[PDB]
């Protein structure tokens, strides 16, 4: 995640193993139950896309759901690209590039790039955009997996 250091700057720090394991354990115990979404939200505080793929990729089991989510993440990403067209002409030397759906999904962007966008002024909340897609896709799952 990207956290604020004592000095008063935003720097990246790694997520903790008993945080990781707590994510694992939630999924083990409460599967598709709604409490998973606030839980997720708390444990995703200050998290990167990269950390969010890590959390999704580290799941075991419920592979039908994991595939449905993936496909929702790509749909929501396809929709990001649709709604926000690429911008006019070449990229400025003085500036950094606008993200695509795949940069938001973490796929085409690097960590330093993910830190550029979030730490820069104005900052862009690429975590929160992926977060809604995850929560939206979580609703899809919850609604389906209701019996």
């Amino acid at each position: 995640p990207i956290v604020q250091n004592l000095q008063g700057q935003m720097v990246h720090q790694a997520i903790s193993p008993r945080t990781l394991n707590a994510w694992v354990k939630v999924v083990e115990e409460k599967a598709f139950s709604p409490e998973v979404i606030p839980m997720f939200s708390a444990l995703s505080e200050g998290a990167t896309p990269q950390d969010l793929n890590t959390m999704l990729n580290t799941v075991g089991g419920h592979q039908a759901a994991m595939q449905m989510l993936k496909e929702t993440i790509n749909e929501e990403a396809a929709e990001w690209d649709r709604l926000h067209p690429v911008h006019a002409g070449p990229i400025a030397p003085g500036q950094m590039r606008e993200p695509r759906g795949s940069d938001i999904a973490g796929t085409t962007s690097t960590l330093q790039e993910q830190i550029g966008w979030m730490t820069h002024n104005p900052p862009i909340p690429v975590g929160e955009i992926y977060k809604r897609w995850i929560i939206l896709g979580l609703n899809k799952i919850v609604r389906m997996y209701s019996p």
Partner: protein, 74 residues
């Protein structure tokens, strides 16, 4: 176990089978295009006659929530 050996039982819910499929698909390392081909093809082919019948009625263009809700009573 090979991906061709993944098949749906005569009493096995599709759901439990689809889970097995994307787990084994999860251990295949092939190009995405090939894995797309495997998805639309092999899944239905090794599905049981009762659900297979059901899935033929969904036609093409179908997505996983609709397949998964379609073969639920079977």
């Amino acid at each position: 176990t090979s991906i061709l050996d993944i098949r749906q039982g005569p009493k096995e819910p599709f759901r439990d089978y689809v889970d097995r499929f994307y787990k084994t698909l999860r251990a295949e390392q092939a190009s995405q295009e090939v894995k797309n081909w495997m998805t639309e093809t092999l899944l239905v082919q090794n599905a049981n006659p009762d659900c297979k019948t059901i899935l033929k009625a969904l036609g093409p263009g179908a997505t996983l929530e609709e397949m998964m809700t379609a073969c639920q009573g079977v």
